[PDB]
Design a protein around this ligand. Structure first.
Ligand SMILES: Nc1ncnc2c1ncn2[C@@H]1O[C@H](COP(=O)(O)OP(=O)(O)OP(=O)(O)O)[C@@H](O)[C@H]1O
Ligand SMILES: Nc1ncnc2c1ncn2[C@@H]1O[C@H](COP(=O)(O)OP(=O)(O)OP(=O)(O)O)[C@@H](O)[C@H]1O
Ligand SMILES: N[C@@H](CCCCNC(=O)OCc1cccc(C2(C(F)(F)F)N=N2)c1)C(=O)O
Ligand SMILES: N[C@@H](CCCCNC(=O)OCc1cccc(C2(C(F)(F)F)N=N2)c1)C(=O)O
Ligand SMILES: [K+]
Ligand SMILES: [K+]
Ligand SMILES: [K+]
Ligand SMILES: [K+]
Ligand SMILES: [Mg+2]
Ligand SMILES: [Mg+2]
Ligand SMILES: [Mg+2]
Ligand SMILES: [Mg+2]
Ligand SMILES: [Mg+2]
Ligand SMILES: [Mg+2]
Lengths: 264, 264
């Protein structure tokens, strides 16, 4: 017997990367589903008995320790931000990806503007160099695929003052991804907000865009020193680490817990 | 000389609870401001040199460890949720406090609906009792005062199955607030979504509303066992712990770092 599209979709929801199970072996849907339901219940029971930590929360904590231990100040800034920040970042009417809230506010699509404000303010009080980072939710309307979510989690680390060179930026990226055990390469790209970026790639998957300033946009933000920064998506890091086929396995979700279907 | 309203506001921004400084001692604004700027720069330099952790992030991590160690599964669910969830929770046209996003979605004003979904789903896979919790951003339009933010951080812990009694709920609340070192009392209140609540009070400040189910609303969420739950605002816990006069000191903000003005 042949499996319908609905049946294959249900098996794919229940399948995890570690399984070696052929969905098209000729065994009936009922037995494949029962086998995978049993495996997934066992997997969830093991998490509940022994770990209980959410992958996105746990990775945020691990990243936070890494940066705090390297001298970066942990930031938690607003997720709801002025729409004016979008304009001031050169996102001239990504502008179509912005979730608007009421009349003058939006959900932040990136962490950079709030971090630029912090760099400027902290430079009046703290010794050179200024090193800060933030992890938290960001939002973009996307044509949904296997690497994009509408609600995702960004890390951005940045530095202003001395030591803001391409080689230091690459060294921090390298130490960071070595800490996570993720192989990568650096390629040149370009984007509208920052211009040239160093994109951090795992295969064809973009883990990060990174920037060596100064750039002309700095004047609009009161930034007047050299700086470096990089933004990473946590769900993409999780996709690599766990070999997920689709990024939704990694997302904030009611449908998966640590990559395991919650429809059991 | 007398201080203007603008001058007093600036001094109040720079003043911290540990200071014993009279703003109305007759000393000129220039010297009071210079003294408090020096204290606040020193305080921020000490954080940067020795701790580097954000109060809201650090308290989320501490709470997460407390609940994970007590057998609760850590949840991270969507912040952008269907507007339909608002209706299904009996928030009939708090309904005025909802931030709408596009046409069918909103920013969650509480964690309860996503947690109700998780309790129902996990009960099909996990042993009794089901114990889960979430910490994260929630949003309400408020008439701004010293205890309300539009963007705040909720903890909700809940349990379904055995052990879902008033005395167990009170015992968890007690162990939790004892862990944080916060004195409290429990008073009866009532709200529209859940009916009678046990409100957890520190003086006149509401730290939490808590509920012993079942309640008639359960049927609309597929909940069909006894349950207990409580929601706490992290910024209110921080306000108590640090003796902040205004909750904005505790909030996600570009204007304060760990209660210290960033306008230095
Ligand atoms: N919609 C999304 N879902 C998940 N992660 C994202 C999304 N958009 C961006 N990111 C992550 O945030 C990082 C920094 O954001 P950036 O603006 O460079 O993304 P981007 O170049 O638009 O990504 P892409 O080209 O894949 O759309 C990205 O490298 C990626 O890891
Ligand atoms: N706007 C807000 N800002 C900060 N914390 C809040 C806010 N609204 C609710 N909380 C926190 O979330 C907890 C659970 O939410 P709940 O719906 O019980 O609040 P509430 O009863 O409306 O609070 P209040 O009566 O103070 O407005 C509250 O006890 C409080 O600690
Ligand atoms: N945000 C990217 C990822 C690369 C991150 C680079 N930005 C960053 O590191 O934050 C610090 C920052 C410092 C100094 C000036 C600026 C700035 C402004 F205004 F744009 F924020 N140029 N003036 C920003 C993405 O998601 O497209
Ligand atoms: N949310 C409160 C704080 C008190 C938290 C009580 N709720 C909670 O603990 O979550 C678990 C939950 C379990 C079982 C059913 C439900 C539910 C529904 F649909 F409302 F979610 N009643 N069916 C919820 C506030 O912020 O007003
Ligand atoms: K597989
Ligand atoms: K999501
Ligand atoms: K004081
Ligand atoms: K805020
Ligand atoms: Mg993109
Ligand atoms: Mg790109
Ligand atoms: Mg990019
Ligand atoms: Mg209220
Ligand atoms: Mg109340
Ligand atoms: Mg209440």
């Amino acid at each position: 017997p042949a499996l319908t599209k609905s049946q294959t979709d249900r098996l794919e929801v229940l399948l995890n990367p570690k399984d070696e199970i052929s969905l098209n072996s000729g065994k009936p849907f009922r037995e494949l589903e029962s086998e995978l339901l049993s495996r997934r219940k066992k997997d969830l029971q093991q998490i509940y008995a022994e770990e209980r930590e959410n992958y996105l929360g746990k990775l945020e904590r691990e990243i936070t320790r890494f940066f705090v231990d390297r001298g970066f100040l942990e930031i938690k800034s607003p997720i709801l931000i002025p729409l004016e920040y979008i304009e001031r970042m050169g996102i001239d009417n990504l502008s179509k990806q912005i979730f608007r809230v009421d009349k003058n506010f939006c959900l932040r699509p990136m962490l950079a503007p709030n971090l630029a404000n912090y760099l400027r303010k902290l430079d009046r009080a703290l010794p050179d160099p200024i090193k800060i980072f933030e992890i938290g939710p960001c939002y973009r309307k996307e044509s949904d695929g296997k690497e994009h979510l509408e609600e995702f989690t960004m890390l951005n680390f940045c530095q202003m003052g001395s030591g803001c060179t391409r080689e230091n930026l690459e060294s921090i990226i390298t130490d960071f991804l070595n800490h996570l055990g993720i192989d990568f390469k650096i390629v040149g790209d370009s984007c509208m907000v920052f211009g040239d970026t160093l994109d951090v790639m795992h295969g064809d998957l973009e883990l990060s865009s990174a920037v060596v300033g100064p750039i002309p946009l700095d004047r609009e933000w009161g930034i007047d020193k050299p700086w470096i920064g990089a933004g990473f998506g946590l769900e993409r890091l999780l996709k690599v680490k766990h070999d997920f086929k689709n990024i939704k396995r990694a997302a904030r979700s009611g449908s998966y817990y640590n990559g395991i279907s919650t429809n059991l």
